[PDB]
Design a protein around this ligand. Structure first.
Ligand SMILES: CC(=O)O[C@H]1C(=O)[C@@]2(C)[C@H]([C@H](OC(=O)c3ccccc3)[C@]3(O)C[C@H](OC(=O)[C@H](O)[C@@H](NC(=O)c4ccccc4)c4ccccc4)C(C)=C1C3(C)C)[C@]1(OC(C)=O)CO[C@@H]1C[C@@H]2O
Ligand SMILES: Nc1nc2c(ncn2[C@@H]2O[C@H](COP(=O)(O)OP(=O)(O)OP(=O)(O)O)[C@@H](O)[C@H]2O)c(=O)[nH]1
Ligand SMILES: Nc1ncnc2c1ncn2[C@@H]1O[C@H](COP(=O)(O)OP(=O)(O)NP(=O)(O)O)[C@@H](O)[C@H]1O
Ligand SMILES: Nc1nc2c(ncn2[C@@H]2O[C@H](COP(=O)(O)OP(=O)(O)O)[C@@H](O)[C@H]2O)c(=O)[nH]1
Ligand SMILES: [Mg+2]
Lengths: 451, 433, 388
């Protein structure tokens, strides 16, 4: 019973959750109303996989998900939509205003009186579970709710549960495009919590996804639905290892064991290789070598950062479909001989490999082609520091003049907190610069006693 | 459920309010009688933002109408939507202010403010979660400016943690209808700058320019100006009433727009605007809306943005559109016109998207700028103010109502201070010592 | 004219409850630098700050580097009185959270062997005044005491209902408060009695931190008028000066006090006022230093006085030809760490300057390095002279 509890916070979290649960319902043969006709037609089976869905006596399947927001709008769209009968009616939406792009409003002022209900329902979901594996928290940097309330929730969860893994998928602010004037303050404030209380944070950038959609899928005018569907595919690839059989299965603990060298370096990038349109699915083989090479192309990264400017510290490749080990070994050997891809000298092995038999599914009305093979790569590297440094600069440009600060102090913060967060960020950045350095020449300086 | 109380004082406020209640009661399908005869199911989902429910499946707006002269009220009752309003909300007296700010603030309005506050308190106590207030009034008038400022002060005293918007029609250089506009405008701005979260800047010359040059109306009347105003007021609060890909409450706009407490004077704008026969010649796309929004001829405040720098801007789009186009267009506008945007804010463009457009359009957009050029407006008034205060041109009409000459000095100094911050952020560097 | 600021930070040697417990110190001071160590994270590093003055009043019977009360008074109060008697305005802010020791530094005990700032100021003022009362000279002193609560002014001495007074701007005399009682005094005893009478009227409420925490800023203003009869009829007031004694309510986090309603409103307003005061103080010091050295007149910049009543009423004292000094108290326990660091972060404002780390020698490594260097030097000397 490899069970996982999903938590969606804020507008971005709820919409990514809509995409994710559409994909999960289609993978398992579950209808929008919760019934599964496959078991009725066959007579019984394991298709009600306990990773995501809980089965009642009548044959209905209720997801193991928790949606939270301070705006009634985003979740009232779900209560009256296609999937109104799938979710439990209890959706934890405060009938009040929103955090208003304010960390303080969502952490100190209004995040209270909704936190207790959220933890009570999370407790109820965790009591139903046997062998709970971890949490998957979806939220967004730069928002009020998605930053502050996620901070509070993560703190309380780390207090209560403690040992369970807590993975985090989040939308980092982009370098150029933005949807708010006070994004840097919220991001720098919530880094201080996501550094301590999470176990592994996967960051995605909307500019990168727009570029991938433009170049690969030939979509000139994408919306958030396409980005959410791509993120859903990635999360499904991560979690497939504990839902279907495979040659090599990689659980959620092996993730953290292999990709996290030190406790403060748990910020890997994520990429998905066979992102291609139906028309271009032809004229292409889509072999293991091609997709493994495409994972390492800088253009296909989901965060606007160049891996060639840093060094790879760990890689985890999760394959789906008609894949066999020998091609994976050949592809890894080919990648190890390229000079543009540099690994830190203190990690000779480098690669973790997992294989699953279930091929990826196609969502009707989607834009990804039907393929026989796929790979999701997760790479813990040092280039991510660049993605932070830009943000730091932006923060400084506003904090020298204390712009937009009185909104934060009016909601229960003091000024010094800002400085504290900034200092923490510098320390984290410094750590990356210390771990990518090559070991000192002949690490024991030199040696050579008698004989 | 976010809910806003609407107040309208004076002739200008009442006219704009009547037109506004016709634009909002045609997007949320409401019969003039008060019944619902819409088609879409999303019209009633968030009807409680503006309307209370009455027993016969009817809907009554939260409007509160104020005036020191009864006649305007009659013009509202004998109209297309006169019967929609509750009779008890028609609070009024007699012997109007006579374009005297002192009468509106101290002598006459002080007697009627208690009744107006009683009605406001009754309306607010029934609300599930009050979001804020709106006020429509004119600075250059009598009962409008004085009573509006007095009510704003009292309400902020009673409800400090709620938003207070304000759609004010200020004086203009050439189109002036009163001889004592400078005094009223100065003493009103002295009150608005202290006790308001957001203020929107409207003046009749910009609206006339829009009517003459964009809409190509031969003989515009006040109805068209109120039409444009109502369009922007409906655009501002679209996200409280409808779903979208990226929402934007009033408080989000306040947080993102104002960098400091005293800079909350905004330049509003609306797009698209075409002149009937030209409609077939222009393709409606997001680039076209972005081009028209940032054009200096489209602003509603008669303040050229090219004479200053945008501290912040906000764009609320309505319609089914691609987020990539919105993001790329705002980034391109920032990058190309780099000289007209302040440098110590990395990105100064808020963007929001709502799914359901207006009734007869496929796409629309509302623009809220916060720029230093607004200083020019105040500076103009200040000039005229001193030109009349050095000689005490009409000062006895004000001091005869219990005022003192020092209050004028306080108001003038406060406006001059306010101009200072704008003039400051207005330059395009500071290196030399 | 110029209004250069001073920053002094004091420590308060343990109290009876903290002596009874086994609490440890965390604050150390050296030169112009203070350093604090996290009890919960002793492994990382200390945090260091630097000010104009660091006062180590931790060991009362100490003879070496003990921040005596007379030392503090000579540092700030004598200079400010001398500036006042020249015909200019001076101000003293008292900042600190509960248990810091603000009251002791501001007032002190009544044994009169270790006095605070204020009785020394008043005694020197009256002593000087009575000293220079020649045939031609005359002096008048009067006092006012008010508070600011949630951006509303109230009178502490007047026994009327605690209503909100109106703030006006006289064109020449600047901001003022209507109907604010102004009382004349003839000795420091009257000043301190009026201080007691007004302090009994402050708005004090119980939080999760202490049962009596200040919720409103307070201002005690001493107006000092000089009138000299030069030979003719010149008693016309030569100069009028202002001494401001301002008591700030400390900043707070909603975590420490999660009470809703009045407490949240008070905390938010206090934090807003403190942030605006920090901004105006920092802006005032910078241009100051600038001119004092650049003598240029970079226009008049623009100091945000109007973003709060507190800075608005103190416009004449903060700006212009004036002097300013903020004194901060930093409790000494290991339990109030979250307090103390925050106070330093507020004291870091007002001309934030480079602190530099506090690296020093490690005894074993120090001895090893010095002995190796000595061996190298002696060996080089021997080799140079052909004796090695
Ligand atoms: C055939 C056709 O396309 O009709 C359009 C039309 O021709 C145009 C010219 C309309 C028309 O607007 C005007 O001519 C006009 C004149 C004076 C002042 C303001 C507008 C229109 O009247 C405006 C009208 O707008 C609506 O129907 C919206 O619901 C609108 N509501 C009202 O105008 C309204 C007024 C009184 C009573 C009830 C509704 C609205 C706009 C913004 C926000 C909320 C509501 C529309 C689409 C049109 C006509 C009818 C010609 C335009 O106006 C607007 C605001 O959309 C002019 O610029 C647009 C471009 C449109 O193409
Ligand atoms: N990829 C992706 N990003 C989104 C989506 N929705 C919002 N975002 C991002 O989220 C950021 C804003 O934060 P929000 O998620 O809207 O914060 P919130 O949930 O609305 O919380 P409040 O601000 O209090 O209302 C924007 O910069 C968007 O880029 C989405 O559906 N997909
Ligand atoms: N230099 C010093 N020598 C001796 N005692 C000192 C010194 N500085 C401070 N104290 C002590 O500090 C205490 C004054 O602070 P105290 O009144 O206990 O806290 P508080 O009331 O929370 N401070 P406050 O902000 O004014 O309210 C007294 O017990 C003094 O004896
Ligand atoms: N937009 C608009 N402005 C108006 C209208 N009537 C008057 N005004 C403006 O308001 C000013 C007169 O103020 P007035 O309405 O008499 O203020 P009141 O006496 O308090 O109601 C003039 O300068 C006009 O520009 C109107 O119907 N629409
Ligand atoms: Mg939101």
């Amino acid at each position: 019973m490899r069970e996982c509890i999903s938590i969606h916070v804020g507008q971005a979290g709820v919409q990514i959750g809509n995409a994710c649960w559409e994909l999960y319902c289609l993978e398992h043969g579950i209808q929008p109303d919760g019934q599964m006709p496959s078991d009725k037609t066959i007579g019984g089976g394991d298709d009600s996989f306990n990773t995501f869905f809980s089965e009642t006596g009548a044959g209905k399947h209720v997801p193991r998900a928790v949606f939270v927001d301070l705006e009634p709008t985003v979740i009232d769209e779900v209560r009256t939509g296609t999937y109104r009968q799938l979710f439990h009616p209890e959706q934890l939406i405060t009938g009040k205003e929103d955090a208003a792009n304010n960390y303080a409003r969502g952490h100190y002022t209004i995040g209270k009186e909704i936190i207790d209900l959220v933890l009570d329902r999370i407790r109820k979901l965790a009591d139903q579970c046997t062998g709970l594996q971890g949490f998957l928290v979806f939220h967004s940097f730069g928002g009020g709710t998605g930053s502050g309330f996620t901070s509070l929730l993560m703190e309380r969860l780390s207090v209560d549960y403690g040992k369970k893994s807590k993975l985090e998928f989040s939308i980092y602010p982009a370098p150029q495009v933005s949807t708010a004037v006070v994004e840097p303050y919220n991001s720098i404030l919530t880094t201080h919590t996501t550094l301590e209380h999470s176990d592994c944070a996967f960051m995605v950038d909307n500019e990168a996804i727009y570029d991938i959609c433009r170049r690969n899928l030939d979509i000139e005018r994408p919306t958030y639905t396409n980005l959410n569907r791509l993120i859903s595919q990635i999360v499904s690839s991560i979690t497939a290892s504990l839902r279907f059989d495979g040659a090599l299965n990689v659980d959620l603990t092996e993730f953290q064991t292999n990709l996290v060298p030190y406790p403060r370096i748990h910020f890997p990038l994520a990429t998905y290789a066979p992102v291609i349109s139906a028309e271009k699915a032809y004229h292409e083989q889509l072999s293991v070598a091609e997709i493994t090479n495409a994972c390492f192309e800088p253009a296909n990264q989901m965060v606007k950062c160049d891996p060639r400017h840093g060094k790879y510290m760990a890689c985890c490749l999760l394959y789906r479909g008609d894949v066999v080990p020998k091609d994976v070994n050949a592809a890894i050997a080919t990648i190890k001989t390229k000079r543009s891809i540099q690994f830190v000298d203190w990690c000779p092995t480098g690669f973790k490999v997992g294989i699953n038999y279930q091929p990826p599914t196609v969502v009707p009305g989607g834009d990804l082609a039907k393929v026989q093979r796929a790979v999701c790569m997760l790479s813990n590297t040092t280039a991510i520091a660049e993605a932070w440094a830009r943000l730091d600069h932006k923060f400084d440009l506003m904090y020298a003049k204390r712009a937009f600060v009185h909104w934060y102090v009016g909601e229960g913060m003091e000024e010094g907190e800002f400085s504290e967060a900034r200092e923490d960020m510098a320390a984290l950045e410094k750590d990356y610069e210390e771990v990518g350095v090559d070991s000192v020449e002949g690490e024991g300086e030199e040696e050579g006693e008698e004989y | 459920m976010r809910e806003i109380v609407h107040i309208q004082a004076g002739q200008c406020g009442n006219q704009i309010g009547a037109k506004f209640w016709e634009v909002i009661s045609d997007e949320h399908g409401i019969d003039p009688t008060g019944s619902y005869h819409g088609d879409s199911d999303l019209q009633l989902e968030r009807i409680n933002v503006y309307y209370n429910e009455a027993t016969g499946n009817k809907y009554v707006p939260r409007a509160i109408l104020v005036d020191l002269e009864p006649g305007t009220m009659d013009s509202v009752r004998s109209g297309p939507f006169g019967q929609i309003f509750r009779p008890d909300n028609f609070v009024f007296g007699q012997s109007g202010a006579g374009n005297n700010w002192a009468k509106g603030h101290y002598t006459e309005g002080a007697e009627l403010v208690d009744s107006v506050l009683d009605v406001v308190r009754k309306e607010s106590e029934s609300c599930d979660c009050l979001q804020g207030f709106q006020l429509t009034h004119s600075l250059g008038g009598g009962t409008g400016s004085g009573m509006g400022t007095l009510l704003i002060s009292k309400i902020r005293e009673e409800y400090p943690d709620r938003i207070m918007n304000t759609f004010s029609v200020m004086p203009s250089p050439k189109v002036s209808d009163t001889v004592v506009e400078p005094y009223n405008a100065t003493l009103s701005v002295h009150q608005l700058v202290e006790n308001t979260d957001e203020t929107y800047c409207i003046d009749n010359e910009a609206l006339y320019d829009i009517c003459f040059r964009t809409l190509k109306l031969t003989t515009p009347t006040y109805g068209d100006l109120n039409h444009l105003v109502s369009a922007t007021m409906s655009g501002v609060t679209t996200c409280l009433r409808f779903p979208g890909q990226l929402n934007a409450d009033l408080r989000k706009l306040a947080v993102n727009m104002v960098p400091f407490p005293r800079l909350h004077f905004f330049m509003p704008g609306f797009a698209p605007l075409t002149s009937r026969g030209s409609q077939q010649y222009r393709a409606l796309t997001v680039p076209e809306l972005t081009q028209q929004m940032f054009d200096s001829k489209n602003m509603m405040a008669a303040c050229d943005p090219r004479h200053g720098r945008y501290l912040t801007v906000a764009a609320i789009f309505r319609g089914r559109m691609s987020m990539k186009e919105v993001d790329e267009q705002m980034l391109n506008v920032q990058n190309k016109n780099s000289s007209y945007f302040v440098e110590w804010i990395p990105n100064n463009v808020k963007t929001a998207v709502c799914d359901i457009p207006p009734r007869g359009l496929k796409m629309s957009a509302t623009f809220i700028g916060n720029s230093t050029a607004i200083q020019e407006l105040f500076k103009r008034i200040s000039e005229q103010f001193t030109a009349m205060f050095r000689r005490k041109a009409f000062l006895h009409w004000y001091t005869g109502e219990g005022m003192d000459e020092m209050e004028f000095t306080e108001a003038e100094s406060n406006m001059n201070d306010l101009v200072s911050e704008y003039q400051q952020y207005q330059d395009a560097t500071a290196d030399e010592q | 004219a110029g209004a250069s600021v001073k920053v002094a930070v004091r420590v308060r040697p343990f109290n009876s409850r903290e002596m009874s417990r086994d609490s440890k110190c965390i604050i150390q001071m050296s030169g112009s630098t203070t350093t604090i160590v996290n009890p919960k994270q002793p492994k990382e590093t200390p945090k260091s700050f630097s000010f104009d003055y660091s006062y180590w009043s931790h060991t009362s019977p100490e003879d070496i580097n003990y921040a005596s009360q007379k030392q503090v008074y000579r540092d700030i109060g004598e200079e400010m009185l001398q500036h006042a008697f020249e015909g200019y305005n001076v101000c003293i802010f008292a900042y600190g959270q509960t248990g810091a020791g603000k009251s002791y530094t501001m007032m002190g005990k009544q044994e009169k062997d270790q006095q605070g700032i204020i009785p020394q100021l008043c005694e020197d003022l009256f002593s000087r005044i009575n000293d220079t009362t020649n045939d031609n000279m005359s002096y008048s002193v009067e006092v006012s005491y008010m508070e600011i609560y949630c951006e509303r002014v109230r009178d502490l001495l007047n026994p009327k209902n605690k209503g909100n007074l109106r703030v006006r701007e006289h064109p020449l005399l600047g901001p003022y408060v209507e109907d604010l009682s102004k009382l004349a005094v003839t000795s420091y005893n009257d000043i301190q009695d009026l201080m007691d009478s007004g302090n009994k009227a402050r708005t004090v409420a119980a939080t999760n931190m202490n049962e009596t925490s200040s919720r409103s800023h307070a201002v005690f203003n001493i107006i000092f008028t000089q009138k000299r009869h030069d030979a003719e009829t010149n008693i016309t007031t030569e100069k009028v000066s202002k001494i401001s004694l301002v008591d700030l309510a400390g900043s707070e986090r909603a975590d420490s006090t999660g009470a809703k309603g009045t407490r949240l409103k008070e905390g938010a307003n206090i934090n807003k006022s403190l942030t605006t005061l920090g901004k105006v103080i920092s802006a005032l010091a910078e241009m100051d230093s600038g001119p004092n050295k650049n003598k240029k007149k970079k226009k008049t910049d623009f100091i945000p006085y109007r973003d709060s009543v507190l800075t608005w009423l103190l416009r004449e004292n903060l700006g212009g030809n004036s002097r300013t000094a903020m004194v901060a108290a930093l409790s000494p326990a290991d339990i109030n760490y979250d307090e103390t660091l925050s106070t330093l972060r507020y004291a870091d404002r007002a001309k934030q300057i480079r602190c530099n780390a506090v690296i020093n020698e490690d005894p074993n490594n120090k001895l090893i390095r010095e002995l190796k260097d000595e061996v190298t030097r002696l060996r080089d000397l021997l080799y140079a002279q052909g004796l090695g």
